[PDB]
Swiss-Prot record:
SUPFAM superfamilies: PAZ domain, Ribonuclease H-like. Inhibited by EDTA. This is Protein argonaute-2. The Piwi domain may perform RNA cleavage by a mechanism similar to that of RNase H. However, while RNase H utilizes a triad of Asp-Asp-Glu (DDE) for metal ion coordination, this protein appears to utilize a triad of Asp-Asp-His (DDH). It is found in: Cytoplasm, P-body; Nucleus. It comes from Homo sapiens. GO terms for biological process: miRNA metabolic process; miRNA processing; miRNA-mediated gene silencing by inhibition of translation; miRNA-mediated gene silencing by mRNA destabilization; negative regulation of amyloid precursor protein biosynthetic process; negative regulation of translational initiation; P-body assembly; positive regulation of angiogenesis. Changing H758 to A/R: Abrogates RNA cleavage.
Length: 789
RNA sequence: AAAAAAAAU
């Protein structure tokens, strides 16, 4: 129900000086006056609401607002630094821009002293924090295009396909111990370019020029996908709901004449009669707007400016976006500073009105660089790897338990013309040598090596292979770029036949490298039930003194959402079992969690003959505004699973939410602490003192090495803890769990269970309502291992 | 899909 208080502060690791993009706010102890607004019509966009309020304030300055400067949340909430001479009866006003009836009303008083008190125990008024947020973002909301908690403006920076890059910034008011903090970060997102729809068609369908004939059923579907749901404007604004199958010259709608009789009239004829316009491109289809019979010719419409792209970016579009937005930690820090200078909060008329001051310097924070765990390998010398800067390798090292592979097949879906027999021979030869060094000895040539084309030849090939070659362990599949055969390989391999398969690009077969092959063996060994490595047993937190299961949960959204929950099946912890469910479209709560947890607990017991005394639950993809809902349903669900298992089974539950999607950045104060070209904080720096929750149990942990851009320190918030973790042990625990990810010899940004859950859900996507839950269900033998690696 | 990191009428 209620998150536990922070148990302690923790002292492990060497200290490091840091700066965070949190700027201290000096806030008065005055009272804020909260006014509610009823404005009619009530379905207007927040910007129109803001202009109405804006003109309402000036227009009624003499009798109502005077010199006061009210702030407005865009909807119903207006705040003033001093009370309006209206409290507390009904005041109805009329506002003209085009006429609106605005009534205004004092709801309560926001005590800022009651905010100061919460910042030091007194265990936090969400409404007071919200009031300040409204104050800080009133001015930028008028000047920029607000997107969620961010602001953007047009800069000229194309992504292609009518998409554009707008630069801007995130801004939010956050609580911490003793102080309100202003979180400020640079940002950039995809927007649709403001242009005639005709040109939008060209960029979408790859036309240098529109100049022609009606679109094929192929072109129209692609175009319909892009423009659907977008706003257009007449050269009045409309919402595009569909693209007509027919051209404007033939697309009809019922038109009532003066006789009263309704006749079908073409869009072209109407625009000719009514608007004196002979359609220049009558062969093109129309935009259907409003709801079901308004049709608009493409040539009279423009894509409305200020529309953010929500739909999935192409691989090239995102890359360009990654590129134009990626930059080192020192670079990012300087631009946050510049934004602070340009924002100039201490001269903003509205924060001045509310007597607020914002410190110009980033908050100084002492971080702690946790010691990485030793990594134990096997083979001849049972070598121990020491992670350096979040990275180690397997030179002179062999798998903890390597799988001696004797039977395997190759299925090349790359053309023999490009992936010739000498490539395969060379590829096989190099692969076996590396596997030999890795302690996963591939013995003997492949028992089978063939060519095939199309996703439709996978199963008959796979049935063949299973029946004929006894003890068949692995099928290495070779693919040419992006193609739907990969999805079919996984479906047949994971769900119906239950065979371990390892896909690999054609180019990685033609030109092989020792590092690529080594990484390939990492996935192969674990998919055959092997153990690449384990955490050094004696170098583990006290939680491993009793049987314990680690859970990773995550739900991915697109039609249906996909919930995935993984669970550790040994005490290392190394091997994980996967549970997955299709569920309601865009529902964050894992509906069938109890059943999923039950399955995992059963599997844990069948593998270790132990029942875990502790359940450590890492939950990814949850925002702070949802913390009480997921905790309510999911903690109860986990608890329901244990009770349903056995009446008196009551293991301690630790519920932790992991967040990568936030805007707190940590920068090295000392240049000597900067790592690599990107100049990021080292792997393992932990923060839980100055920018964290005033009362609750939360911390930042950057467990990964920053390769490019600015690192995102993962945030962890303990929603529940029966197990009474200290700060140090938990922080050390999650950090060590980040070293158990099998796909690479690197510490990753989130603990392996959380990461695995993401992979499981992503794999479920390739697996494609009774049917949806069955096309996602996995084969019996496959479930015994980590197929999703 | 070798892999991690990195922006989202």
């Amino acid at each position: 129900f209620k998150p536990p208080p922070r148990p302690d502060f923790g002292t492990s690791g060497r200290t490091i000086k840091l700066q965070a993009n949190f700027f201290e706010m000096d806030i008065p102890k005055i009272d804020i006056y909260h006014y509610e607004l009823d404005i009619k019509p009530e379905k207007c966009p927040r910007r129109v609401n803001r202009e109405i309020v804006e003109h309402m304030v000036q227009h009624f300055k003499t009798q109502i607002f005077g010199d006061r400067k009210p702030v407005f949340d865009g909807r119903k909430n207006l705040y003033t630094a001093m009370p309006l001479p209206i409290g507390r009866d009904k005041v109805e006003l009329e506002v003209t821009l085009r006429i609106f009836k605005v009534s205004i009303k004092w709801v309560s008083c926001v005590s800022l002293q009651a905010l100061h008190d919460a910042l030091s125990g007194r265990l936090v008024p969400f409404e007071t924090i919200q009031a300040l947020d409204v104050v800080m973002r009133h001015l930028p909301s008028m000047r920029y295009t607000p997107v969620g908690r961010s602001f953007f403006t047009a800069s000229s920076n194309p992504l292609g396909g009518g998409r554009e890059v707008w630069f801007g910034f995130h801004q939010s008011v956050r609580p911490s111990l003793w102080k309100m903090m202003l979180n400020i970060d640079v940002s950039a997102t995809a927007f649709y370019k403001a242009q005639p729809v005709i040109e939008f068609v060209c960029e979408v369908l790859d036309f240098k020029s529109i100049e022609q004939k009606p679109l094929t059923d192929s072109q129209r579907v692609k175009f319909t996908k892009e423009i659907k749901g977008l706003k257009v404007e007449i050269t009045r604004k409309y919402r595009v709901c569909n693209v007509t199958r027919r051209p404007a010259s033939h697309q009809t709608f019922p038109l009532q004449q003066e006789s009263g009789q309704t006749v079908e009239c073409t869009v072209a004829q109407y625009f000719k009669d009514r608007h004196k316009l002979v359609l220049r491109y009558p062969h093109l289809p129309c935009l259907q707007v409003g709801q079901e019979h308004t049709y608009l010719p493409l040539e009279v419409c423009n894509i409305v400016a200020g529309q953010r792209c929500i739909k999935k970016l192409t691989d090239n579009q995102t890359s360009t976006m990654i590129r134009a937005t990626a930059r080192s930690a020192p670079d990012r820090q300087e631009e946050i500073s510049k934004l602070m200078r340009s924002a100039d909060f201490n001269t903003d008329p509205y924060v001045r009105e509310f007597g607020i001051m914002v410190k110009d310097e980033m908050t100084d924070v002492t971080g702690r660089v946790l010691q990485p765990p030793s990594i134990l390998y096997g083979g001849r010398n049972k070598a121990i790897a020491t992670p350096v800067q979040g990275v180690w390798d397997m030179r002179n090292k062999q798998f903890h338990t390597g799988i001696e592979i004797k039977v395997w097949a190759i299925a090349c879906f790359a053309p023999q013309r490009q992936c010739t027999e000498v490539h395969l021979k060379s590829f096989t030869e190099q692969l076996r040598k590396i596997s030999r060094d890795a302690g996963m000895p591939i013995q003997g040539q492949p028992c089978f090596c063939k060519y095939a084309q199309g996703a439709d030849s996978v199963e008959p090939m796979f049935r063949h292979l299973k029946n004929t070659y006894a003890g068949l362990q692995l099928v290495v599949v070779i693919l040419p770029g992006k193609t739907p055969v990969y999805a079919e390989v996984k479906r047949v391999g994971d769900t119906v036949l239950g065979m371990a398969t390892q896909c690999v690009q054609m180019k990685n077969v033609q030109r092989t490298t020792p590092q690529t092959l080594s990484n390939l063996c990492l996935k192969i060994n674990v998919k055959l039930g092997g153990v690449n490595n384990i955490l050094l047993p004696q170098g583990r937190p006290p939680v491993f003194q009793q049987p314990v299961i680690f859970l990773g949960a995550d739900v991915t959204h697109p039609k249906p959402s996909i919930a995935a929950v993984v669970g550790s099946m040994d005490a290392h912890p190394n091997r994980y079992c996967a549970t997955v469910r299709v569920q309601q479209h865009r529902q964050e709560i894992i509906q069938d969690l109890a059943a999923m947890v039950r399955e995992l607990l059963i599997q844990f017991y069948k593998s270790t003959r132990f029942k875990p005394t502790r359940i450590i639950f890492y939950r990814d993809g949850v925002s702070e505004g949802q913390f009480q809902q997921v905790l309510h349903h999911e903690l109860l669900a986990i608890r329901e699973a244990c009770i349903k298992l056995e009446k008196d089974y009551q293991p301690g539950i630790t519920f932790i939410v992991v967040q990568k999607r936030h805007h707190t950045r940590l920068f090295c104060t000392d240049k000597n602490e900067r790592v690599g070209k990107s100049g990021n904080i080292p792997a393992g720096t932990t923060v839980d003192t100055k920018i964290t929750h005033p009362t609750e149990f939360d911390f930042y942990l950057c467990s990964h090495a920053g390769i490019q851009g600015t690192s995102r320190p993962s945030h962890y918030h303990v929603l529940w803890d029966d197990n009474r973790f200290s700060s140090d042990e938990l922080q050390i625990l999650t950090y060590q769990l980040c070293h158990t990810y099998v796909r690479c010899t690197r510490s990753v940004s989130i603990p392996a269970p959380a990461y695995y859950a993401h992979l499981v859900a992503f794999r479920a996507r390739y697996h494609l309502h009774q049917a949806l839950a069955k096309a996602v269900q996995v084969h019996q033998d496959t479930l015994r291992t980590m197929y999703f690696a």
